């Protein structure tokens, strides 16, 4: 519950635009629960909003490492790759995610976007 508490605190900070506070909350939760993919996925989002795409990417990778069946982790990873202008890798990441969650609409959209560039 303490982990959920910190995650919620982070989500709230992010909602009021306090991204650094959100990162601190997610990072504290991660220290307590280092295998929680949701925390890395949320922190990846916060880093992407902040504009630190390398860290958004690292957290997206960790999300996929922890929970390979979860499509959203690949979206985190792939979005970071797009920001990093690594589109070939972004496309392969959407494809990799689809090997786990074939009907995921966000991954399908991402793949479509990369195939249309």
């Amino acid at each position: 519950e303490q982990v959920n508490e910190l995650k919620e605190k982070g989500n709230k900070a992010l909602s009021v635009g306090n991204i650094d506070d959100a990162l601190q909350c997610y990072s504290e939760a991660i220290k307590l629960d280092p295998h929680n993919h949701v925390l890395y996925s949320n922190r990846s989002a916060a880093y992407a909003k902040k504009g630190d795409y390398q860290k958004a990417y690292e957290d997206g990778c960790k999300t996929v490492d922890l929970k390979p069946d979860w499509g959203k982790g690949y979206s985190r990873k792939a979005a970071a790759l797009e920001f990093l202008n690594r589109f070939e890798e972004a496309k392969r990441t959407y494809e990799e995610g689809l090997k786990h969650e074939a009907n995921n609409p966000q991954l399908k959209e991402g793949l479509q976007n990369m195939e249309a560039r």
Partner: peptide, 8 residues
């Protein structure tokens, strides 16, 4: 630009 999905 890429979409940043909502947090969970």
């Amino acid at each position: 630009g890429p979409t940043i999905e909502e947090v969970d």
